[PDB]
């Protein structure tokens, strides 16, 4: 029933006194977000997770770079099994 949530502070956001907690997986994610804001008391807050993204081959390399590029570079990964 329990999943352990690590709350990792990025990009100048404050570090929390308790970085991890166990939470029942049936609650809505809002619970987690509201809980952050309660502890931070910060107007702005972004909450995001890493993810993979498989672009359509018909997509122009520029539009990709605009979205997932920096410094005139994009890092594209490839695999043969997954």
């Amino acid at each position: 029933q329990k999943i352990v949530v690590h709350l990792r502070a990025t990009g100048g956001a404050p570090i929390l006194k308790q970085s991890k907690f166990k939470v029942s997986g049936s609650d809505k994610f809002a619970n987690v977000i509201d809980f952050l804001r309660r502890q931070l008391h910060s107007d702005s807050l972004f909450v995001y997770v890493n993810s993979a993204f498989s672009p359509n081959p018909d997509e122009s390399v520029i539009d990709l770079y605009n979205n997932f590029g920096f410094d005139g570079k994009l890092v594209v990964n490839y695999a043969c099994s997954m």
């Binding site: 308790q18 907690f21 166990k22 987690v32 809980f35």
Partner: peptide
């Protein structure tokens, strides 16, 4: 062992 809520 930490427990949220």
């Amino acid at each position: 062992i930490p427990d949220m809520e």
